[PDB]
Design a protein around this ligand. Sequence first.
Ligand SMILES: Nc1ncnc2c1ncn2[C@@H]1O[C@H](COP(=O)(O)OP(=O)(O)OP(=O)(O)O)[C@@H](O)[C@H]1O
Ligand SMILES: [Mg+2]
Length: 530
Amino acid sequence: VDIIFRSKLPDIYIPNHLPLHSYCFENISEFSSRPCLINGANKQIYTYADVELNSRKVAAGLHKQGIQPKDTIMILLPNSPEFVFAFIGASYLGAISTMANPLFTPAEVVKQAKASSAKIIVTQACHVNKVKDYAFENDVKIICIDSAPEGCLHFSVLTQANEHDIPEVEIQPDDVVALPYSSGTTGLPKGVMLTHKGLVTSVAQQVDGENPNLYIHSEDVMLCVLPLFHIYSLNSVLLCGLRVGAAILIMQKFDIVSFLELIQRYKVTIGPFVPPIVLAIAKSPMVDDYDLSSVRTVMSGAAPLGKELEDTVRAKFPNAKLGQGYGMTEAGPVLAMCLAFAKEPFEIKSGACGTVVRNAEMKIVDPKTGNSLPRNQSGEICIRGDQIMKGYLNDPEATARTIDKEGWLYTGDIGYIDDDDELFIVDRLKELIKYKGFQVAPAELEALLLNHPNISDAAVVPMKDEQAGEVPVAFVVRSNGSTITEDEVKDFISKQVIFYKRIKRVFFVDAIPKSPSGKILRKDLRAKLA
Ligand SMILES: Nc1ncnc2c1ncn2[C@@H]1O[C@H](COP(=O)(O)OP(=O)(O)OP(=O)(O)O)[C@@H](O)[C@H]1O
Ligand SMILES: [Mg+2]
């Protein structure tokens, strides 16, 4: 007998029979002349009508270039209007976009291209070298958004196409539309098949309903400073933004000053961040010199964030609801979303990752028995609903091990749900540090380290130890100014925690490695230790 957790919100109608473009643009007529994409680099504004129009032009363009239903294009781009136009244009065709980290090595880009069977790679001149030979040898066309050197087509060859030249197409709910990849935090990146049905479901779960979990409307301005090739931005910023008619402000590269200025300048109202952004915000002393009163909702997604740091940043946006969302590529991606974001906001506790999304079921399973758990007990987070992935790309066996025959997705994440239906993430199961019979969550310690005014960044990993099995160790970046000592660090931790959570060694460093998508690269630090 499974003990099953659900949202405090009612189930709603989800039109997951509609293709993604059709769902996203369903209500476009009520906001057609509102800004859709704001290019922060050049101040250029595309209206809702511009964006549908360019997307339809690109679809027609892709079709003339040989893109057929179920064919794949690769997007190898930084955030830009053209990323959007390509993604949606492929969708118009019943085709598929795979999205690649543009700072990947040539071996990486090629592997992804081979695996996804991309017929076209849409990128910039600066990356052409990565895929030049491979493309020629495999009749894969290369289209550049900026200038098109030897053998490449320019993106304009897509936008020259006529919007009324999109062919008749029969799109199935279960057709793939997106091939995002996991961030590779725990190993090589995995290709994930996301469907029209999955993504419409997941966008609806967030922004539709009488009382939506994530309340966004056509007068909001959503900042987009996270990579759209990761599923958190593409879904919760781009697709959710389109669905409700919000302006999407496109930044390329976060730095705290640029960030604050653009927020002020463009009157951003929705801030979809990650813990490294929140960390920056909490440690900067100048946040107070800026007019951030417009910001009404601040989300942190993508990675563990502790309550003390979350609270620090809370105090710096007294005008906003601040809270967390929890996503996993394999999950569509959103599994839970802060209810302080709802149109009729619920109460929340600091440090929760949210409450499981409506129109879904969640269970917490102990991984040593396999039995589901009651409230306030730590186990493996599981989820079932229409939003989850069709499966891993070219890997039905891993899919089968990951989503069981009951249609339960097993995240590999440990968590508990408390009496208020808030979810808390402990850490990734395999990241739990094994000190005798005890299990230590690296993220709990990291949260406490980040609390120290003289610490600017940190990561906790296990070390090989003779009699304990593994001991917790910490990598610490000192603040500018301070010369905090190893023993100062250890004693600071020691005063606050139960004995088996103590830090055995601290190593001072200049930086902690992180994915572009905002997750600490713990494995890279293990390798430094080994
Ligand atoms: N709010 C959150 N708090 C804690 N962890 C989170 C939160 N949001 C996401 N995560 C973590 O991020 C994961 C989703 O990350 P993603 O799908 O980008 O790949 P990854 O797990 O980071 O890397 P890979 O699967 O390639 O090892 C979740 O499984 C969870 O472990
Ligand atoms: Mg993962």
